Amino acid sequence: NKAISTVEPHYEDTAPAVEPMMPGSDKTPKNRNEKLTQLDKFRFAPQGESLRTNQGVKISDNQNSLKSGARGSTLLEDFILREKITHFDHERIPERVVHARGTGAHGYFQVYESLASYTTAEFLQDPSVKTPVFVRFSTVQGSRGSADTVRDIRGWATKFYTKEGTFDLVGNNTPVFFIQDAIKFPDFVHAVKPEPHNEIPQGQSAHDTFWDYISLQPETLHNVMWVMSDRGIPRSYRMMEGFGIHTYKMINAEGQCHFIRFHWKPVYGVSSLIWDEAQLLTGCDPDFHRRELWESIEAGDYPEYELGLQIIPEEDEHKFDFDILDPTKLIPESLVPVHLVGKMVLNRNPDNYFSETEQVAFCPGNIVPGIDFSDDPLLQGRLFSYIDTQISRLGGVNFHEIPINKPICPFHNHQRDGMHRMSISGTANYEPNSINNNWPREAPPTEGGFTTYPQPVNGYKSRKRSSTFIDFYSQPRLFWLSQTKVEQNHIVGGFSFELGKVVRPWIRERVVNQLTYIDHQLAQSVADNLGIKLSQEQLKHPLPGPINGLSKDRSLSMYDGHHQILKSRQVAILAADGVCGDAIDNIMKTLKKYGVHGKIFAPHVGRITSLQGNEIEVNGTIEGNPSVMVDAVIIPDGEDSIDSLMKNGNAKHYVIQAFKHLKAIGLQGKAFKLYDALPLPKPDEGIVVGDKAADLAEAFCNVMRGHRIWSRESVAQEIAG
């Protein structure tokens, strides 16, 4: 009778008589902006509402097709079924051709002080204006189901909804790109994408065709160095840098042009995973970066970034040992410093991933008055591409009427029709007209009408790479020389693991040969790893010289040049029934004092009982949340807890793995027994042992500030875990 009712219409309440992830409107409705307010009209509230067809007809039985009898044939006249299945059948739209895998969030931007001296852009004029933003973060190679923590460039697209136009800063998490001229983009992407016969491999550049292309195109080496480094595996989108890469122009009210490069510097520091850890994480949480960003917004650890600019007066364009118009060159911050000019806060998750994140459309050609393009030949080709791709991705030329894509300022023009036209126009569809007195009207430049800066143009129509672009190794060498030794090793690790998966040996030898033109130690280390004998002529290949008297730049090193923030990090607390309850409380309160999140992982979900008899709510099982998902591990005392964990292979392995991943491990009291029973060397600077819980946790927090125990790395390679 009750089983019978589950296949009959459901007319009664199904709701029962720490919290899950929820839509932003449910969880942070108080965080608002002008764009979110515009989106409210498109939001729905089915509470108290009947289930209905798309035409507004109430449905009585959502459990059964209309048939010729209870056991009969389904009838073609069932329009309810056919409308339902039909909508389902056509849910999917094409994924982005690159950066298919991504995640989005709303926030706002504030300029610190008017930049009128350098630009007329309205969203950079008034420190009291809160300019809404939408940001999509992404990887690049993988399709939309691929894993978050792969080794890849990360895309970083910010849509500023300004009162005089929508401006898109479409950048990456490294300051250079792989290629110089847009014409090569499909060649480079085809090389990195899965190979066309077997569509293997997903979310990895470790295959023949990528390294083949690298080996024939030395311009790629600079960005390859970045992605072979630990920059290629950020800990979190909240903890990477961001760059527009291209040189743009900035025009002020006098008509004076400054060359400009955009930056985002994360308030939460710059931190990365390690390769083995990253790869494991694609296994146990392929949504790690999306989830972490979603949950950091719900926690209050709101992503914050400072917008920076490198500012170069027009007359200084030719004073560097590199073309500022070359997208494989960066401008070292030692020569041209980054002025922090404003701040972005991400503070609201979307309600519907598809409506907002999937359908959002960015393009670098989406500039606003006060900003202009440069002759960077990568950027020039990009301007064509973004609008064109969106024609098929979002089904036509009205994608700007999709609510996430709408400006918040007026947008009157003479364009008409196209697929899924939302607007209803009633005035003259041509300019000049008199029948409507020529409204809407062109705006004079002094009124905000966009104009192009009158840069001089002298030359010959030609297909030719500028001779000033032909420098392929000096910046890779500078970036190498700027790394710490641990960072250099991980670079060598990156190249060797990736080339290890290249089948054709001549491709690996050809890449190693390229490396001998950057640094001989780097080439030698990779070669040794690949069983490659380097000739003496190779060991002696000539190395590039300093760039404007520069051979290192500290800002190019994650760990020596940037800060590590303790706040918002995650700590696994391993505990079973019988754990010391006061220990847990004391650890928790301490973690919280520094803004760190303690997660209780136990052999079962629900609650565990402390030896004091109190119940403690568990955050998940040990088996479900392995050590790769947390920054550090702490184990509280309690005889029955420790004994349970020592019988648990996963709990023992949790400690071995975190050790090998160079993470801080805290051990209280009898908990050290567990460490001592394992095949692990004796405690080092990152094994905090103590009897007092509060003391131990304070010391444990202090060790976390260092991010990882780099000195452990040598012995870590001998650990069986």
Add this chain to the structure above:
Amino acid sequence: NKAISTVEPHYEDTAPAEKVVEPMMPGSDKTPKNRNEKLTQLDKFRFAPQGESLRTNQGVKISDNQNSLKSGARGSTLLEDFILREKITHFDHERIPERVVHARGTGAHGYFQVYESLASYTTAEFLQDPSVKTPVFVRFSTVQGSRGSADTVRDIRGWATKFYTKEGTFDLVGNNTPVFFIQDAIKFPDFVHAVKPEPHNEIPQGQSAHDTFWDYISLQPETLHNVMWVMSDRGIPRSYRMMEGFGIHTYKMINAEGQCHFIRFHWKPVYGVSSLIWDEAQLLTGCDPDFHRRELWESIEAGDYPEYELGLQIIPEEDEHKFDFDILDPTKLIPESLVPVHLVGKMVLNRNPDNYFSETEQVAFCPGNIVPGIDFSDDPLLQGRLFSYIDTQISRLGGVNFHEIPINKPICPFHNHQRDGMHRMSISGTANYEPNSINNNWPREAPPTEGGFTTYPQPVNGYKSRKRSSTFIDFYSQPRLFWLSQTKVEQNHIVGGFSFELGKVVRPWIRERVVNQLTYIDHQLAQSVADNLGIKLSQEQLKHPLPGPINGLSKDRSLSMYDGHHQILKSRQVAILAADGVCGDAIDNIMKTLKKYGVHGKIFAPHVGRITSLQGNEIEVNGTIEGNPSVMVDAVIIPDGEDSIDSLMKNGNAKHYVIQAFKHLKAIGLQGKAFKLYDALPLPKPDEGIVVGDKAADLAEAFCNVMRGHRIWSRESVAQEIAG
């Protein structure tokens, strides 16, 4: 200077000269002698660029593929650069929508052969003549995840087979379990939405382990049977070569005399049924998301061709109502010990695609694509499916002419009066209506006795109504049947699947409602899962009524993967761990003993290229220990060599290799000083799955015979304690 030359047009060779296992290649490169009538049809659409110029799509030679046309070498890019715009345009529009379900998939060409004429059951031409080789294209897939998601997830596996027969293309569109989750097509979007990533955050990818899925399960007990299958190890197959397939639905077959037989389709693999274990499967998605796709492609390049026997359960029309379940209910299987499976033919997949997008991505299957001799039953799930596959393909493949895409074309004639539509390839020149006289009514209808399709005149009696058939209201007997048929090991893995999945469900009332549903299936099942979830079952929950036997059945052997099916040794993979100083003759005798049983040995060393034996000889290695962990192999063997052992004992991944392969119940072979490495690990007294010997070929022989059991299940209780 060479550096300048790389940014100017490339007019010279780039391949290497000489002096020098094989990369994966388009099937036309590696297996051109594996032919069929379909591949020959596809030969017309292939191209040899060797010695050809680089051209626009209009055929215009390109002189400089390295630079946009600008106003000067350092100038602005000109709008007039049609070469650039054409190339970027096409790239900008490469992607098409993924399939709304089973978006992650792999395809391979092959052929089907019937054993004997099935004429007494069906007129279907491809089941009439053992001499003919019917071309097939198969697409295997997962269900939930998008196109980039990982192979070895816990999911149902899809298995669609397109038969290019001479009187029509027939699609058998199946899954790797014999039942489905839901009874009626109208529920399909609800179920799929429930299992797909949740709509606010699109989390999680390739997992049912989240609240909305198990919310749906707890409210729709019809789902429970197929949930048992996916929570078992059926949900993590070793290989698409080592799983079963089922059409699930009762279909009809119709012989030339108009007789109807109710049937159900089966695929039985020659290479047996073998599954991964969960911890292993999960690690596998991290180190190789392409694992099944790669394995299938490499199996074909190796000549370990996927082989499957088509099977038929056949039920005379008059037996329709004789079972303790409705044979039109797709949450119901027909136990093979009530109605046996009759093997009637054999499929072999023997060629890989040339272009994944052209063939695998663009192929369209639909269970509405039957041929004369086969008809539909009133299964209310199947009936809805007929509508969806054509409809979905209109947007996925860009319109109603997707049948003209080469991979989709039939190999027989196909004249009709359809016309136009987006990307019409064929050019028609005759009357476009029927009846016509201006072309004498050609193409013409075909009489049934000539092979024109006809529906078998099944009686239809009822009232127009939306109602679930009373005969479908049995949600718990077949889950119980399935549970009681598993070994205790398989039962434990089912409990672990429920517990891991429900462990990731945030809302506790959903976890409790599922555990409650399990009390109506088996009290011990519920209790084990409730223990792992911190749920205390009430006395009234443990006294919930359990269902009775099914036509006198409480167990069916075929429903157990390891008790009721075969393990096959041939085609399995073995890690041979070695470093510089390995005993060369041990590797040779191992390699040759493995070759003897058709087992592939892989030398994994601390570095790619070559290791040198103590004898002094160079050995090409298959890849690094680091880049090829133990989850990628069926078993591990460590040859002798004091310098090799000494190296691996300092390698953290080589030691973990043994530990992990031990915990994953795999067979481990150690020769001589190799055991020194084993004893130094935290592992117990060597068991039946550790083979130790000094003589290499002796040890390999005993090693291969231990591989015969697939996994060492008796080791399971101790492996839990082993430090990961």
